[PDB]
Symmetry: C2
Subunit: 96 residues, 2 copies
């Protein structure tokens, strides 16, 4: 299945720390057997609506192909790190 993986990392990291976080994510995708189809580094962005107390984050977006039964474990592995604040995974298709 094709998925979009949206990651929000700590906005306060220096680029050396961010490089480590990005490397860890890519290694996790490969280690879980995902085929990585696109990586977009969106960078520092701000949630405007709804209203959050901590609206800034460092946004990363991945498009991947992988089996549905492996997605949950991957997502949880990605978010275990303290510098990964949020992970959201959307399947690009549904049964209907």
């Amino acid at each position: 299945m094709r998925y979009e993986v949206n990651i929000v990392a700590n906005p306060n990291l220096d680029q050396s720390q961010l490089a480590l976080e990005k490397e860890i994510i890519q290694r996790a995708l490969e280690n879980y057997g995902a085929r990585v189809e696109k990586v977009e580094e969106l960078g520092l962005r701000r949630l405007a609506y709804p209203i959050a107390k901590d609206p800034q984050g460092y946004f990363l977006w991945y498009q991947v192909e992988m089996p549905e039964d492996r997605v949950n474990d991957l997502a949880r592995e990605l978010r275990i790190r303290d510098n990964v604040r949020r992970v959201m995974v959307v399947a690009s298709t549904t049964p209907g």
Copy 2:
């Protein structure tokens, strides 16, 4: 400011109803004075992570240019309709 507007509509609508919802959104963007730079109709998708009781939705994505002081009112106008389940607006830049 440039914003990404992520809309999740009711996944159970027929295309006649969805056409009305899309027309309403575009009219609201124009009526609020946003410049609409891209419209992507992503269609029926499923939240895979985190786990939601109602994970399916009809996803729409807009990129717009508009003043920051008008975004909140626009977002609230967009979501007042029952068929618009979620609106999320992200500013593409931050002060830092």
